[PDB]
């Protein structure tokens with residue numbers, strides 16, 4: 001139900017910046033990147049209290065519609081109600097995610113896409129702006 | 134160019150779009166509406182295209198059919214430059230604010246509850262989009 005954008009043509013090394021406001025009663029939110037809705041090089045899913053987890057970032061891939069292996073992070077710099085900006089870039093080996101407090105983590109590049117063409121937002125986060133390199 | 138959907142832009146809300154006009158630009162397009170066949174605003178600055186030079190052409194599209202064109206008398210765009218446009222609407226008009234602060238109105242002929250669809254085309258690369 002959040003924004004869906006296509007034809008992004010984000011190349012390796014280029015930065016996608018997304019700013020939004022976390023809902024005051026947020027359970028979780030999602031940013032999806034990839035080729036299309038069924039082929040995601042990154043599903044980024046901060047969980048405040050959702051899907052079994054509390055204050056945990058869960059990332060995954062999706063390939064031909066099938067979820068890959070989950071990856072959980074050790075940090076959670078989100079707060080209900082607060083503005084948050086996330087920055088994402090990739091190379092052939094990994095995506096690098098930069099979180100609102102400057103913390104960076106890597107997620108393996110599983111799909112080998114030439115470019116990221118698709119983004120989508122969902123859950124308890126209102127997008128305020130998106131910047132493309 | 135970029136296509137966005139599920140924008141849920143409500144009356145009174147501002148959409149800001151910043152992009153790069155190509156150095157050899159002929160024209161560019163920003164479309165807003167419900168879907169590609171139902172546009173409350175087709176915003177088409179023509180440098181040299183479609184018969185016009187340095188002219189903004191606007192139109193609507195309804196069930197795939199173009200409406201009556203409107204042309205502006207000012208052209209604050211330059212090839213090979215960054216350009217920003219800001220758009221809002223109410224039931225009567227869309228209001229477009231151009232890079233030099235010039236504003237004009239375009240009648241709202243579809244009376245959509247919300248703008249859900251945006252697309253860019255031609256010689257413009259979107260760099261940033263904001264919703265406030």
Ligand SMILES: OC[C@H]1O[C@H](Sc2cc(Cl)c(F)c(Cl)c2)[C@H](O)[C@@H](n2cc(-c3nccs3)nn2)[C@H]1O
Nearest residue numbers: 028029030045051058059060067068069070122123
């Ligand atoms: O791995 C990422 C996913 O985990 C589970 S499904 C699942 C569960 C298990 Cl135990 C797994 F082993 C695998 Cl591989 C997947 C979520 O339900 C999914 N999810 C959240 C959401 C939204 N959250 C807010 C708006 S939409 N939409 N889909 C996704 O985050």
Ligand SMILES: OC[C@H]1O[C@H](Sc2cc(Cl)c(F)c(Cl)c2)[C@H](O)[C@@H](n2cc(-c3nccs3)nn2)[C@H]1O
Nearest residue numbers: 160161162177183190191192199200201202254255
């Ligand atoms: O009115 C808006 C349009 O005018 C003509 S069609 C037209 C012509 C006349 Cl004489 C009319 F009386 C009417 Cl009602 C329509 C353009 O060809 C269209 N157009 C531009 C473009 C692109 N330009 C860059 C990339 S895609 N793709 N379609 C559209 O701008």
